[PDB]
């Protein structure tokens, strides 16, 4: 198949990647505007140049113990259709182009977790980056309840 | 001369103060290099969107990234020389204090 | 003790030498900032050549130029501060040598 | 002794005349900067004429227009320095003349 | 009369610092000429790329290359005049030093 | 004989100054290497747009960059040799003065 | 005088041998510059055989030849400076032998 290009980032002292096309902007994390009785995944909203953007907690979703504004310093702004949303992350690394041959199966034993959500591990120089299907994850997880 | 020893100690305090000021400016430059590196990564993402037309711009972004890393290395060399300079100020202060003793 | 004082004069030369080494790296920062400005100019040219797909490239070109200008201004300030610091070190050694003539 | 004072006055005249020679070259640079500015305006018309093939050239013309402004500004800062410098020669000449009659 | 001679030495330092400040701006002019040469090449490359529609770009590229070379030549003549000027200052300083032993 | 010792010291200053004149040309080589990096970037940008018809251009752009870095590193060794040579001249000048005062 | 004079002669010999090492590196640089000029000319021949997409690259390749030519001239300017510097050492050696017996 044709090569696939990923934006590579850190969460919980581990390395992850998502689709380059879906990324709008990468910005520094700053304080989130909060609304009461909201599901744990949603931090709140913030204003980017006159536009209100939802901010979501990737740390809680992947069961990582990192602290809100202390250990996470970057927001990656993602657009799916008419929805714009920022994922909270430690930092951003590089843009990486991967062939399908260098994508290894995810180690996880849960069925749709290790297929539909986790695309696999990108192998570069015997180092692994976790490839995440952000489109499937946001569409499924936010609309489950 | 006791006042000469005190005056040299005051001069040591001034160049210790200067060393922190030199450190403060290069620390800001170290931050500007960090901003430059993130901006180069944003440029690489922006280049990918424009495909064949962005390929030259991606080379330029790569060079900006090399310069940001080189600036950070240059900042570390200055920071290392400040660390050596700080040790020399304490050695000079110890020596001039010793020269007031004997 | 005069030889202890001679060690302080020698220590001032070590600090002066360390300051010269920092100044050479500041010239490297000025060169990197100047080179970064040429990269910003390339980004501006590529933004125009990419046209309708180059509007994001234009934002990068302005921001990279602003960071290069800020870095160049900081490099100029730190060079002046190093020159003032070298002057203080020479004045400090001159005072110690002057106090040796009495 | 008068002979040294007279010789130093000749040196002040040589420093002033050497400074005048630099000022004439600065006038040529001010002219070259003006020519560069007009050439950039001519280039903008050629870029406008060549339309979508002129887009990259228009960025080059704009930066050339900026370099002309920088060259002229730098030449004027040198003129200000020359005006102070030959005024310092008037002060120095008066001090040397005063040293002769004191 | 010592005090007036000390005032001449202060004035000579002020002139020397001013001359070095003119030389500092001449480095900016040389850097601008280097930038103009980069722009001239970029205009020539665009002229080569645009062929028949590059003809107006090509004449500007040739003329601006001549202007850059005139500016660089003028900057070199000023560098030589600065070299002569600091030599003229050195002779004046030498006369004061000679006077101190007379 | 004192005046022959003075003449050797003056000759040593000319040798040091002549060594510094080599250092000025080495600074020009560093600038040419920096300009060569811009040319390598320009070659890379044309190659990037040309793609599979620009593979030779892309190889040449890398090899020109390798030649520039190799040339720049050779200049760093020359600068180090000039620094060693200048220090040797100051030692030689100091030794002939010591012979004068023995 | 004695042993100190021999040390001055040895220091001049060390400077001369160091000058020969600089001359070897400069000779290597002139060879690299010639090879670069030929390589750029060969690349220009490939660009000539690449039709209308070689036109911008050919202008850049010509500039690489101009930089190689300027580098060779600058390296040869250094070769003359080495010849002048060694001749100044021969004058110094002649004076040192005269000083040795005076």
From Swiss-Prot, chains B, C, D, E, F, G:
Intracellular or extracellular location(s): Cell inner membrane
Coiled coil stretches, renumbered: none
Disulfide bridge positions per record: none
Domain of life: Bacteria
Purpose of the protein: Receptor for the attractant L-serine and related amino acids. Is also responsible for chemotaxis away from a wide range of repellents, including leucine, indole, and weak acids. Chemotactic-signal transducers respond to changes in the concentration of attractants and repellents in the environment, transduce a signal from the outside to the inside of the cell, and facilitate sensory adaptation through the variation of the level of methylation. Attractants increase the level of methylation while repellents decrease the level of methylation, the methyl groups are added by the methyltransferase CheR and removed by the methylesterase CheB.
Family: Belongs to the methyl-accepting chemotaxis (MCP) protein family.
Protein name (record): Methyl-accepting chemotaxis protein I
Native organism: Escherichia coli (strain K12)
